Design a protein around this motif. Structure first.
Motif, PDB file in Angstrom:
ATOM      1  N   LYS A   6       1.670 -10.277 -10.457  1.00  0.00           N
ATOM      2  CA  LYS A   6       1.672 -10.974  -9.188  1.00  0.00           C
ATOM      3  C   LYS A   6       3.072 -11.102  -8.643  1.00  0.00           C
ATOM      4  CE  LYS A   6      -1.326 -14.601 -10.339  1.00  0.00           C
ATOM      5  NZ  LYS A   6      -1.994 -15.547  -9.403  1.00  0.00           N
ATOM      6  N   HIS A   7       3.414 -10.107  -7.857  1.00  0.00           N
ATOM      7  CA  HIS A   7       4.619 -10.074  -7.059  1.00  0.00           C
ATOM      8  C   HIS A   7       4.445  -8.847  -6.165  1.00  0.00           C
ATOM      9  CE1 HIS A   7       6.913 -13.500  -7.660  1.00  0.00           C
ATOM     10  NE2 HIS A   7       7.716 -13.125  -8.639  1.00  0.00           N
ATOM     11  N   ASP A   8       4.537  -8.914  -4.844  1.00  0.00           N
ATOM     12  CA  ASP A   8       4.424  -7.660  -4.092  1.00  0.00           C
ATOM     13  C   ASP A   8       5.580  -6.754  -4.539  1.00  0.00           C
ATOM     14  OD1 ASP A   8       2.398  -8.995  -2.835  1.00  0.00           O
ATOM     15  OD2 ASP A   8       3.483  -9.287  -0.947  1.00  0.00           O
ATOM     16  N   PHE A   9       5.423  -5.435  -4.407  1.00  0.00           N
ATOM     17  CA  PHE A   9       6.509  -4.527  -4.790  1.00  0.00           C
ATOM     18  C   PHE A   9       6.314  -3.098  -4.314  1.00  0.00           C
ATOM     19  CE2 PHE A   9       9.246  -1.958  -7.563  1.00  0.00           C
ATOM     20  CZ  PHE A   9      10.426  -2.662  -7.406  1.00  0.00           C
ATOM     21  N   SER A  10       7.454  -2.414  -4.268  1.00  0.00           N
ATOM     22  CA  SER A  10       7.464  -1.001  -3.933  1.00  0.00           C
ATOM     23  C   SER A  10       8.565  -0.252  -4.671  1.00  0.00           C
ATOM     24  CB  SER A  10       7.612  -0.786  -2.428  1.00  0.00           C
ATOM     25  OG  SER A  10       7.887  -2.001  -1.758  1.00  0.00           O
ATOM     26  N   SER A  18       4.622   1.274  -6.738  1.00  0.00           N
ATOM     27  CA  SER A  18       4.458   0.063  -5.939  1.00  0.00           C
ATOM     28  C   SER A  18       3.094  -0.562  -6.203  1.00  0.00           C
ATOM     29  CB  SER A  18       4.580   0.375  -4.447  1.00  0.00           C
ATOM     30  OG  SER A  18       3.450   1.095  -3.985  1.00  0.00           O
ATOM     31  N   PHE A  19       2.939  -1.808  -5.758  1.00  0.00           N
ATOM     32  CA  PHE A  19       1.691  -2.538  -5.941  1.00  0.00           C
ATOM     33  C   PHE A  19       1.685  -3.830  -5.132  1.00  0.00           C
ATOM     34  CE2 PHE A  19       4.460  -3.502  -9.581  1.00  0.00           C
ATOM     35  CZ  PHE A  19       4.644  -4.855  -9.384  1.00  0.00           C
ATOM     36  N   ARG A  20       0.601  -4.584  -5.247  1.00  0.00           N
ATOM     37  CA  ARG A  20       0.450  -5.824  -4.500  1.00  0.00           C
ATOM     38  C   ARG A  20       0.357  -7.012  -5.444  1.00  0.00           C
ATOM     39  NH1 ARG A  20      -1.382  -2.460   0.228  1.00  0.00           N
ATOM     40  NH2 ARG A  20      -3.620  -2.508  -0.272  1.00  0.00           N
ATOM     41  N   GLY A  46       3.405   5.727 -13.197  1.00  0.00           N
ATOM     42  CA  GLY A  46       4.633   5.321 -12.539  1.00  0.00           C
ATOM     43  C   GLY A  46       5.245   4.041 -13.060  1.00  0.00           C
ATOM     44  N   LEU A  47       6.570   4.028 -13.143  1.00  0.00           N
ATOM     45  CA  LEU A  47       7.306   2.869 -13.622  1.00  0.00           C
ATOM     46  C   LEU A  47       7.091   1.676 -12.695  1.00  0.00           C
ATOM     47  CD1 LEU A  47       8.723   3.174 -16.224  1.00  0.00           C
ATOM     48  CD2 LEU A  47       8.703   5.373 -15.014  1.00  0.00           C
TER      49      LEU A  47
END
Length: 59
Positions: A6-10, A18-20, A46-47
């Protein structure tokens, strides 16, 4: 192995991911990088930032 994040990211690297917030990520390769894990999503490896997720993906 499964992990939630749980942290937005790219991703910051091409081979990163990346993820949401609250997304279900497939944890599969951690070690050579005690900070960025190699997870799976849809059909890509992916890392991913370690600080934006914690172990307990579940469903």
């Amino acid at each position: 192995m499964e992990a939630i994040a749980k942290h937005d990211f790219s991703a910051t690297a091409d081979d990163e991911l990346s993820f949401r917030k609250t997304q279900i990520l497939k944890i599969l390769n951690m070690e050579d990088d005690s900070n960025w894990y190699r997870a799976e999503l849809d059909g890509k490896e992916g890392l991913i930032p370690s600080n934006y997720i914690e172990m307990k993906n579940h469903d």
